């Protein structure tokens, strides 16, 4: 509709005459939500994490609401997103902590605690070799070299808040973004759909991983076979976001290609 409650939100934090809202755009209602709730007030006392929370929280409100990845949020988008209402929750729960959609503090700390014990030269930024082990090397160095390609964003390092993205995308692959977050990883040559190229080139650095423990790999061909009939993609050979969203499987398609780890448990 056109005079919404989405509307309405976007004419209150935009800039004059804009239809959109970007993170910046955020910061005077984080701070706001800082300054009031209950549960947060002590952030007033702890700048770093006073600005690493405001800043997760934001990332966490474009990773689930900006589903364009534009960077700029829209009123449909809003309107498709639980964040309103999440705000009408806000102003009565004082537990900040059962607010697990954006707000959590819990969560937040969780994601600093994370980027912390990843961030080695403790220089605010997550280099490629770090990453890679992460989670006990859970990804592969070909995910990770993607994600450092600018696929999901060369200066070679991951920001504060980049990591965000990647850690809620890397523990919990049943999101849409996640979805799309990995896809748009997968998907080398950017065309939008992953070709059976693009899938070798994934798994033969997983059986040269199984080959150097003394595992023989499933050959391509019979994984290729699996993942097919696992994903009931369209076109075989040209593998999309829409068939992958609509298996309801994905996650288990992306361990197969780039978790060793989580593949060896299925
Ligand atoms: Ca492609």
Request: aromatic share 14%; with cysteine.
């Amino acid at each position: 509709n056109h005079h919404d409650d989405a509307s309405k939100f976007i004419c209150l934090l935009a800039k004059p005459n804009c239809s959109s809202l970007e993170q910046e755009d955020f910061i005077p209602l984080l701070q706001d939500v800082v300054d009031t709730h209950p549960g947060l007030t002590f952030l007033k006392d702890a700048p770093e994490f006073h600005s690493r929370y405001i800043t997760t929280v934001i990332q966490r409100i474009f990773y689930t609401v900006n589903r364009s990845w534009s960077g700029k949020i829209t009123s449909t988008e809003i309107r498709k997103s639980n964040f309103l209402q999440t705000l009408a929750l806000l102003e009565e729960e004082e537990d900040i902590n059962q607010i697990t959609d954006y707000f959590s503090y819990e969560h937040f700390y969780v994601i600093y605690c994370k980027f912390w014990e990843l961030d080695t030269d403790h220089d605010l930024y997550i280099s490629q070799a770090d990453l890679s082990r992460y989670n006990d090397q859970a990804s592969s160095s070909r995910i990770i070299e993607r994600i450092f390609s600018g696929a999901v964003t060369k200066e070679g390092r991951m920001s504060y808040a980049d990591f965000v993205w990647f850690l809620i995308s890397e523990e919990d692959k049943r999101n849409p973004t996640s979805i799309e977050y990995w896809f748009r990883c997968m998907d080398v040559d950017g065309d939008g759909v992953l070709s059976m190229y693009e899938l070798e080139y994934f798994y033969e650095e997983q059986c040269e991983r199984m080959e150097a423990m003394g595992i023989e790999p499933l050959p391509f061909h019979d994984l290729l076979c699996q993942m097919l009939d696992l994903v009931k993609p369209a076109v075989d050979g040209k593998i999309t976001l829409r068939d992958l969203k609509r298996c309801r499987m994905a996650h288990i398609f992306y361990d197969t290609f780039f978790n060793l780890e989580k593949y060896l448990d299925h």
